[PDB]
Amino acid sequence: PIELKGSSFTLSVVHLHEAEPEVIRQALEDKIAQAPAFLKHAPVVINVSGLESPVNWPELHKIVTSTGLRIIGVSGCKDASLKVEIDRMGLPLLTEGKEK
Amino acid sequence: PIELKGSSFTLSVVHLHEAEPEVIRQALEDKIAQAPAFLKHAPVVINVSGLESPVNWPELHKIVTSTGLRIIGVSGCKDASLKVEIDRMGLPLLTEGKEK
C-alpha cells in the first residue's frame, strides 16, 4: 500500500550573500522581474553558506516569502543557533549535490 | 548579492498506492515504526502516480501530515483537478529523476 524510495530532483537554489535586509529584498525583486519564467512563485532551496553569523532568520524568511518564493528547505547552514531557528519553523535542512 | 543556481538533491519519495484512507494511515504508521531513522519527521515528496482518479486531496494531505511527514511537493500527478487542489495549498508539483 506504501513504498519508500530515493530519487534525484533538480531544484532551484537561491544563493544568498551577506547584505542588508532591504538590499536582499531589492535584489530578489529585480531577479524576479529579470527572470519571471524561472522565479515567479518558484519553489526554491535557500543557500545560506554566503551569510555571516549571526543570521536573523525570522526576518530573512519573511523577506524571501514576501516576494512569492516558496522555501522548500535551506542548504549550507553551519551555524548551530541558525539551525534551531530553521527547525522552529519546521523547514528541512538539505544537502546539495552536483550542479544541474 | 543574490545568485540563482540549479542543483541535484536526493529526496525521499513516498509512493502511495490506491487504498482506503484508514489503510493508508495504518501503513504509514507501521513504516514509521519499522524505519524510524528514515521516516520520523521525514521531509518527503509524495508520489501519487499509483492512485486512481478522483483523489480526495485535502483528506489525504491531512492523513500524511498527521503522521509527521513533511510534504516537500507532489510527483506523478496527471489528473488536472488533482493539480488544482494541490496548488490551492501552494505545494510544488515536482518531476522525479533517476533512482538514488
Swiss-Prot record, chains A, B:
Name of the protein described by the UniProt record: Septum site-determining protein MinC
Upper classification of the organism: Bacteria, Pseudomonadati, Pseudomonadota, Gammaproteobacteria, Enterobacterales
Residues of the full protein shown: 5 to 104 of 235
Top-level lineage group: Bacteria
Functional summary from the UniProt entry: Cell division inhibitor that blocks the formation of polar Z ring septums. Rapidly oscillates between the poles of the cell to destabilize FtsZ filaments that have formed before they mature into polar Z rings. Prevents FtsZ polymerization.
Subunit field text: Interacts with MinD and FtsZ.
Protein's organism: Salmonella typhimurium (strain LT2 / SGSC1412 / ATCC 700720)
Signal peptide stretch: none
Family designation: Belongs to the MinC family.
